[PDB]
Design a protein around this nucleic acid. Sequence first.
RNA 1: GGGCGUAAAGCGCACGCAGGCGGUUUGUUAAGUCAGAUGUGAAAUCCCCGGGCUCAACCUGGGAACUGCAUCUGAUACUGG
RNA 2: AAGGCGGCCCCCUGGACGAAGACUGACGCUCAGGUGCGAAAGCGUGGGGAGCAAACAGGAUUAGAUACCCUGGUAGUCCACGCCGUAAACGAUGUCGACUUGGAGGUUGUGCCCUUGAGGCGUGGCUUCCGGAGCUAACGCGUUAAGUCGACCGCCUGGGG
RNA 3: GCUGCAUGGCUGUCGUCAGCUCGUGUUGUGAAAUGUUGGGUUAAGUCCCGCAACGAGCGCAACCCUUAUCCUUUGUUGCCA
RNA 4: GCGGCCCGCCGUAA
Lengths: 157, 207, 218
Amino acid sequence: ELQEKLIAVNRVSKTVKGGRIFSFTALTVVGDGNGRVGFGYGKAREVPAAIQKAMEKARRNMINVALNNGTLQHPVKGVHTGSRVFMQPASEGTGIIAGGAMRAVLEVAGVHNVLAKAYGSTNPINVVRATIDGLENMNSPEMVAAKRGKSVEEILG
Amino acid sequence: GQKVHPNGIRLGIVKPWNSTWFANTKEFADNLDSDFKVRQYLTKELAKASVSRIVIERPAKSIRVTIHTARPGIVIGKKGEDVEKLRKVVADIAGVPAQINIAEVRKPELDAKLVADSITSQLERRVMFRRAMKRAVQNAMRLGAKGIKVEVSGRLGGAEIARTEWYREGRVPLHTLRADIDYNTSEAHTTYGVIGVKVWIFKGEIL
Amino acid sequence: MLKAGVHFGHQTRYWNPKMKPFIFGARNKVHIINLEKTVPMFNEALAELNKIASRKGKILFVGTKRAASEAVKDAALSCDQFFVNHRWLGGMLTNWKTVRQSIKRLKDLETQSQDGTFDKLTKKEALMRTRELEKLENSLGGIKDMGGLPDALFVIDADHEHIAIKEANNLGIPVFAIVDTNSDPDGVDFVIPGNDDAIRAVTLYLGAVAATVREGRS
RNA sequence: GGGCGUAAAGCGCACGCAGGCGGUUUGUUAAGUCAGAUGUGAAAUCCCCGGGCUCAACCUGGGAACUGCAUCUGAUACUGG
RNA sequence: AAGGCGGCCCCCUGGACGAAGACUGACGCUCAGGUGCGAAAGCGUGGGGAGCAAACAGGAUUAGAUACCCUGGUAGUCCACGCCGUAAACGAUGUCGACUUGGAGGUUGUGCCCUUGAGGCGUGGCUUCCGGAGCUAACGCGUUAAGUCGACCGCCUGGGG
RNA sequence: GCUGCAUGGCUGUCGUCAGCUCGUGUUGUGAAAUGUUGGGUUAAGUCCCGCAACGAGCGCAACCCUUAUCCUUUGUUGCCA
RNA sequence: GCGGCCCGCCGUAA
């Protein structure tokens, strides 16, 4: 049932007394298509080994987010070492217009309408943190109403 | 050139010879030549069969040949007509009368010679080598063995230097004389030169 | 309770500032623990352990400090529980799959041990096998016959055994450590303030827990 | 809607005029600010609701927009006198 | 304030801090252009000259040695009165104000208690070293912030040229 | 006949030197680290103790040949108390 | 505790 995506693969070296030895890294994302998503990162000497090793690593690491009809009501931003990510709700009919790994993350998450945009550096590994960046730090109406000791209908009004 | 031949170093301890007979100086050369001729002819003829090992023994006025195989039906035919033709040809090659025997290979995934030329045959049909190596290793580990190592070397499609790869899991001790190591090689001719294949199988340590 | 059968913190210069709510007035150069807020949550933790043992939770005991060693090994193996006595290995929980092989080797060797020299009289091999059995039993004696992944852990010293606490937090298992003035409440823990190196204190600690667990089965 | 310890970037250090920014009540003023109203802000172009050329480019009807300026009336929480 | 300031004594003179009490009543912060103060070297006029020492002269070393090493040695280093206005002038961190978990010291005041003793409780100023959350590309900073904020000023826009 | 710089196979050397890696688990955004480091020993990553590591593989050692001491069997073409 | 000893043509593994 779980849907998986592959983001990027690259070759990585290391120097020893006899020369250089090479290895590969894989970055994958996994989501349920409803609001739960995770990511994993693996290393190996051969590409399929790293590909498979990232998968279950992503599977064990999962979080849940609360969306609303395919998005939420928060223009939210998230930051990491060198990435700034901006996402905001889209009305309807639009898609997942977004540059790189943000596309895959928002697709596996379950979102169908968003207006994302990325600033700063754009290496895949840091920008994938867009999940942890702002997705789970989003607030739904009922939770805000409960936390503020109020009712939802007058929270909206 | 660093490794001693695994089969040669164990011929006196835990391994038998392939040719067993006694002779003097006057007949050594021609005995060896006749054995070479018959072995080469049999290997050529039974290429479509699954031949593993040929053992030649010389009774006083005769020659005895035993063939190990995994598909004895094809070698032995509907009736014994094909073995009769082979016996006639062998008795032609070596003047003394000949008698033929057939052996049976129970587990073809062992006995590295068969694995090696199977991999070469796969390579001739233009298949990715990694799949073949992994397939053979998994089969051998599944049928029960404490170790196996395979390797391929040569022009693997690219023009750059012949690259070498090898996979191994389990135990393959080469410095222990007590070990039962079965080793054989093969080669495959393609459109880009020849490719070498070597296989080690660890059947089990012998006291 | 009322016997005040527990000592108090070490010193006012070796103390974690996170323990300000639990601290009492310090007089003799050393910190004093407020006992007025140690009974209720202690009883709550006892009730929690009781309901877990009624659910055959397979509680686990730790606390290697050369003082609680014999005490925890006596409290365990008494009702129905297991214990760790020496050299908590890094990865008993996060890497349990590998420790299963060590348990299996121990089982094989203890089966062979009862008739050890009969199989072979080469004394060197028998000697080294017995030596390795001794080396292996201390680190796995209390855990050999347990199913795997217990449902609760009781810890004597919090900061001294932080590796076990981190493993439990990673796995997601409730823990019941005892926190002193030089430790800090970090994991999801039923906190029991009080001294942890006083023999009377630790004995009072384990007696109630052992009695509660042995009652929980019935 | 960016930066200045080491990537480019804090004057060698002070005093100080013009400028920029003001701790707290009370009372007045309505300058800033806010709400209405009126006069203007050409037509054409853009947008919306329509119509006619076999449809479309094309032409046309009505409406919003023209973020502004001035004048009058009112409000007094926050800046200013 | 910065550059910086060390034998002892006298004369003239500036700033900081603490205790208690009284007084005036927002009199404040920052500051383009302007003004002042700035190590060493260097310049002008007049003195002084022990040691040290650019330039310079010999002796070595070296393939060569206009250097490092050795023997000498002038300007200069010192004083008075004027110029010059630059330094890795560096905490490579601009000036004010407010808020935010802790330990171990140094130095200088003051209150109380037996003031017994090198005692015990506090309470101000200025300075070293570890380290939490947080921040940071990382190194690290961490109540004397590179943390959370406000006011004003000065600077940056690929490397050479 | 040309191409060992298109290859297989087979050799030399560092060097009979004692090292070289992997699975799982943790630490770091990452290249990676940890284990393999630390105390004592050995010809030796040979071993004990300690330690967020827990175990494995190729290596080391041992199994092979020959030489040094005795005991059974056999006694020619070999030996003579 | 201090005597001396300089250089290495142009491009070029995936």
